[model samples]
Target chain A: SLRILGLDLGTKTLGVALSDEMGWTAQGIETIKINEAEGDYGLSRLSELIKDYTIDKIVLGFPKNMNGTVGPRGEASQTFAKVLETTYNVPVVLWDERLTTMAAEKMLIAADVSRQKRKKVIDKMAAVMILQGYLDSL
Target chain B: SLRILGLDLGTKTLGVALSDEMGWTAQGIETIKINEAEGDYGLSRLSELIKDYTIDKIVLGFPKNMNGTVGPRGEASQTFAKVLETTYNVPVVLWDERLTTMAAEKMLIAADVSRQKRKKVIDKMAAVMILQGYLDSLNE
Candidate 1:
């Protein structure tokens, strides 16, 4: 009965997902506004989700470059992991998320979702895939 | 809600207690067999309780010496905490447990419990008090 929180941390928003009680699947939660320049990482909202799910650990997407190396955003994800561990005292599992964005984009396009609407929910869907990949790994 | 597992970890037995749903109180669970010399810390049973209660954290009793220094058992408690975190990935909160034994004994004595029976449940009762003290302190 341990629950996991999944994250697709973006420049201005953090997409979130939660694992089911049995840890079989991941469900999209919400996207929280974030501000990296102002030193804000959306922890205020993240804390609520952490306690709401009694989160055991965090599966944070670590986006990499096409050449299979940590990219700039992936570097930020490491810092985000440190912040999460320090703030919540919970373990952070960095998962490979290089394909999450592409997969999410294709899924929405396949369903004929409007580009505007796809952009609106891309992060959330990516978070679901990020978390689902991690869960399936276990 | 976060459930906490309170432990009065002993040489051969680990007395357990679990926090109520509201985190306002703690109830005694059971004593699990342990063998420290054999490197067995009763983790098998502890894991069961950890999942059963969906334990968010562990409040382990740290029995310090009366003069305000960590005793032998207190040092062992630190090791126990590390083992728990490594095994279950749960946060372990160490709380002073010096007076828990005395308080548990006094309460049972006040109730006129038989000496033999009091010995049987002493650790379990102490775990309840240990966890309760932790929960009560949150209000302040």
Candidate 2:
């Protein structure tokens, strides 16, 4: 049984998604709020989830510019991947997350979700997409 | 002084921007709330702003698909443009708004804006980008 954890790290939220036992499907679990100004990145919460799920691999969403250029956001994701690898001793893979948020927002809109609620769930939906893309490749 | 009013219509909010008197630049003005179910689409607020600012033209953000196809959202914007044109009897143009929201989010993040605040202003910033892009084309 192989379980994979997917993360979409935003400036204020960390979206978490988990794969099935056989790694065939990915589903959003929860979104964790982080306060960068307060220097609380929610690593403890992530650690607890990793232990609880017995995650075998970690996939981090990497947001690159539309022009295929690595910007500040991409750099931030790289830094996050490094921290995850060092802290949890887990193999972290950066998955291209371009347009995932947009796709997630469109899906939520199609489902008739209200604007406020859509904002709350968009990150998690993006995480599901990021993980699903990775799982599809495997 | 003639003004151009720009709008970024979202599911719940309409972001507004105003062009300069000479139509060279645009600045985000405010966001107006709307209720789709109740049929309150913020037209009254828009009318008030149009009158107050003496606006002559309207630019609506059009969200086209990444593959250059028009989706439900894009069609909605087209409907919005028609309503604006028919109701206000003003010239309406649809400007491409692809990646405008992402650009706004990235800019806000770079500026260190709080998460709560960013959610509030992201639409308005996207409206500004839509209008600014249109205004830039006028000069070119």
Backbone clash pairs for candidate 2 read none
B80-105 in candidate 1: lDDT tens per residue? 88987788688888886222354334
Encode model 2's per-residue lDDT on B18-125: one tens digit a residue: 988778667667788897678777999988877767778899988767697889878878889999999988899988733345534543453445677667555446
True contacts kept of 2: 0.00
Question: In model 1, which regions exceed 4 Å deviation?
Answer: A1-138, B65-69, B97-99
How far residue A57's Cα lies from its native spot in candidate 1, in Å, is: 51
Q: Which candidate is the best by TM-score?
A: 2
Task: Calculate each model's fnat, 2 decimals.
Answer: 0.00, 0.00
RMSD for each of the candidates: 20.4, 11.5
**In terms of TM-score, how similar is model 2 to the real structure?**
0.47
